[PDB]
Symmetry: C3
């Protein structure tokens, strides 16, 4: 009961339109049957749509408008399309992503493979997307452009208690987008080789983003949060080549702890447009130069004075972080300049303590811009590894 | 084999008693069939009971006495009954929780929907409860009382290697209770709008409580631990209105790290009755005033001198935490008093280092009561933001 | 489609060779059918093999050579064979592990129950092993030897995006082995009473090991990592009696944060053969004496001067950790010696800050060996709890 398998369900008016030819059409007809049956606001349990191991083409955008809908598969089936596209496929035993593999072949007018939204009142709640694969197939015009106008899963209406786990997102301009998230959970996923990985837009409350593997694109964000409060980002392994790896705009009282960050460009961790009272601690922050040839020479338009960690806001605590910076003197922007590990762009009362910096070149561990006030820097470098353009900055040298 | 679907299984002596009318009765008959079949202590693999998407009434308490029993569903189906009860339902498209929805309608004599217990020897092991929803339906006498005498899942006998994940608990006086837990795992769950969320009573060892979303009641605990050793509490997003958010009584060598805590009352983090050698670090602790009108004016009977974090024990390390305190001067208890972020009630050798406090009012970041001995306060406030009633306290100003 | 249940699938040439008698033979025939069917490198989605609740004997080693293969069960079914073997079984209601229980009865020539490997090009990707039980049955010659020459799951070829979750490993000389892991995920598992738990050999990239419960053997490792980069180890509860609990050899830029460590021997956390730029923070490290009689008197051949935490490498940051050391003066190796909490064996620029030590005996919180250069020790003990055999060590007393 209330359980469907995409491969056994026939579309009565269109019998040869299967999960293989258009799983999008198939899922929309299933959701139509769910609404068919559950007409009572007091009797709308939802349902589970299972996606068997296989290759499925999605031409028709799926509109999800039922609460507690679960779309699950048996695997994330990730496969590096990036390496395939930059390698010689001769004799290769695999040329594509697997598991419950959905190839997103959406039209411009309906970008998203899945678009969750509903009008009227109760906000959508309890929707779960798990253990299946969303593949954008390829990048266009350039094979390494990270552009293709497709989106995997997008939640456009305010949502409560959503759960996104065990997923596999690959080669999508936008993997996952969730606006107005509340008690959202994005954990144990593989989101990579996507222009953008996770975008929490609009605003948010007590959301959790942990245990995930992320890799974005030069012109995209890996993890982005807009006007969020209570966001916990922990135990994620964010690797190369978003424009940033963690980017908060105007979020307050959030926490970024126990994470692994690896970027090839300036501003891997950004706190923009007045982020207040956030905790950034116990994170490994490694900045280095792009190591995979196909992408050598690409950038995010930022120079090394932007800082690996960029803070614009008040009362944020950046501590107990390990900075490993290895970048060719010649790749350092501007010529002659000392790389900035932590830049306090503006704001009041920011505190920077116990941050170990390791770098191949002379670097300013912490820089407090002339706009900053009442900042505090403790055990984050010697006096000559710290530049304070403010005169009310309190500094304590690492002995 | 050894797999049942609650909707297809008929109770031989009682044919019209279905999962819909009494899933409790159904599950008990299934467990009876399991014991029927597995009579050999050397041949007792257990089984899996699947709960299809749907609305199910539970009148009869389920007694779980077989090891390695797995009761799974397809979703946590959380839905804010609290907001429904305090809003105008007209035209609402949903009035109830979904997914594998079990409405707990238990009788006083058998409170618990699920009661796991067994006599004799081997302790019960490997029991798994996952991906389904337990809903207490409503609160009684007051719709906002958080009282109703029902319990979701309770483990009364010593257990080994239990696993509780992907669940949905809502409107239950007691969501989850586990006595004598050993190598227990409570992760990736949504437990909210419950009088009490997770109660680890009796005693415990090497337990993990992480990646969970929890919100309790004024007269209840969010996460409670009794005489636990090796407890790890990490990556949880604990929000509003337990009497406390984390409460340990006599636990030793446990760890509370990388969490998001948000409370509306004093003592959000409590270490009572001599807790020794525990690590409380890298947590975001925010205390503020109740923000949802229906509950404005409710309390936990504690004043602001109890401290947001209350410690009674020895050698505990409270460090690298960010305290965000925003409370109306007029709501501050006692009139004229300065709020206490960290109170070291009693104990020896407690260490408080690198704790950033942000508050709208003059506040004592750390207070060491006259009973305390050999305490140490480092980089947690200026000398005037610290009150030591002891004389062996070692203090170092945040420059 | 592409979904098999091990109990319904007959081996055409060998009809009575069931999952019960040789699930190994069964799975190999299933994989043979998958390869039968998916001959196109462009059409190799993989499949899912489901293992129903039950007792299954594995005599034949399973060779997994298809990408995106998912082998899943309904439970980890852990059961302490150690306690059974050292107790009186009379009247016991369980004598063995449950859930989707696979008893590994492999022959010397094919140790591993599951051996994942493939020749040629694309590296194997997206393979998932979840929610089932691997039991080695017993230890041989000694019942408490932790030796039996069996291995549970071993990945010998370079792999990408593997996922190992919800598993149960018990009584195996080697539970899990994964060479050349990339974006690997080992989370939410129960690996205990195994000679060795998790072995990441060869080399690795951006791997995550979190939310796991581990206990190894005196002659084995709990978590081992070889030449790994970007390894994140977080939220794990590692308990008693590996020779070590976390052991890295030549890993760089990895992070071990927010973990619970409990050992009975020296060197619970080891950074060997030049590990550079690693973050070890926010961990609870408890060293004490073996508490279960059957194992009293056993050891790992290391003395108390090796240190509970042993570091040999450069620029590592060991901070915000809580050390609880309780060991009988008489069990302390060498007689008369002061236990070493943190030993910096050799290396340049290591930083040790904010580490709280609690011990029943006079102990050297930090020892910097004469080989070390430019080390830093802050707030990790008084000058007399710190031994620096170097002269360029910068030290700052815990006031
Ligand atoms: O930088 C990681 C980035 O590159 C990809 C290839 O486009 O992975 C390639 C690889 O070699 O990079 C890391 C190594 O540093 C390793 O894990 C990879 O397997 C890509 O998907 C990533 O986004
Ligand atoms: O304080 C959280 C508490 O209130 C509930 C309503 O009873 O959620 C309401 C809500 O508005 O509170 C938070 C914002 O502060 C937000 O996530 C909610 O959606 C409830 O379940 C919580 O226990
Ligand atoms: O030290 C843990 C070790 O011992 C076992 C028994 O061989 O567990 C026994 C037990 O008593 O140890 C811890 C307590 O200290 C507790 O969780 C156990 O249940 C074993 O599996 C462990 O590896």
């Amino acid at each position: 009961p209330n359980t469907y398998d995409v491969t056994t369900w026939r579309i009565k008016a269109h019998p040869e339109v299967t999960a293989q030819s258009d799983i999008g059409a198939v899922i929309n007809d299933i959701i139509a049957d769910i609404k068919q049956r559950q007409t009572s606001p007091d009797a709308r349990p939802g349902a589970a749509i299972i996606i068997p191991p296989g290759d499925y083409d999605l031409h028709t955008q799926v509109v999800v408008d039922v609460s507690y809908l679960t779309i699950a598969g048996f695997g994330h089936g990730f496969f590096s399309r990036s390496i395939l596209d930059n390698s010689n496929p001769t004799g290769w035993q695999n040329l594509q992503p697997g598991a419950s593999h959905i190839r997103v072949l959406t039209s411009p007018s309906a970008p998203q493979a899945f678009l969750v939204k509903r009008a009227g009142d109760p906000r959508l709640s309890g929707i779960v997307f798990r253990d299946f694969c969303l593949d954008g197939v390829g990048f266009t015009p350039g094979k390494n452009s990270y552009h293709n106008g497709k989106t995997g899963i997008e939640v456009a209406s305010d949502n409560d208690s959503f759960h996104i786990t065990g997923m596999g997102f690959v080669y999508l301009e936008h993997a996952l987008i969730v606006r107005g998230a509340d008690a959202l959970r994005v954990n144990d996923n593989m989101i990579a080789e996507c222009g953008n990985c996770v975008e929490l837009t609009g605003a948010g409350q007590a959301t959790i983003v942990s245990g995930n593997h992320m890799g974005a694109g030069p012109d995209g964000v890996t993890l982005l949060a807009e006007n969020h409060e209570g966001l916990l980002v922990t135990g994620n392994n964010l690797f190369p080549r978003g424009r940033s790896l963690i980017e908060f705009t105007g979020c307050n009282r959030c926490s970024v702890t126990s994470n692994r960050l690896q970027g090839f460009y300036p501003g891997m961790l950004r706190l923009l447009n007045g982020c207040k009272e956030n905790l950034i601690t116990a994170n490994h922050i490694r900045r280095t130069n792009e190591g995979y040839p196909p992408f050598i020479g690409r950038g995010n338009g930022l120079d090394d004075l932007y800082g690996v960690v960029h803070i614009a806001g008040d009362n944020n605590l950046i501590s107990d972080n390990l900075f490993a910076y290895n970048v060719p003197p010649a790749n350092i922007a501007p010529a002659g300049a000392q790389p900035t590990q932590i830049l306090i762009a503006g704001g009041d009362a920011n505190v920077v303590a116990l941050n170990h910096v390791v770098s191949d070149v002379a670097s300013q561990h912490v820089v407090l811009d002339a706009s900053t006030t009442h900042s505090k820097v403790l055990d984050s470098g010697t006096a000559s590894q710290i530049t304070s353009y403010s005169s009310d900055t309190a500094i304590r040298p690492t002995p």
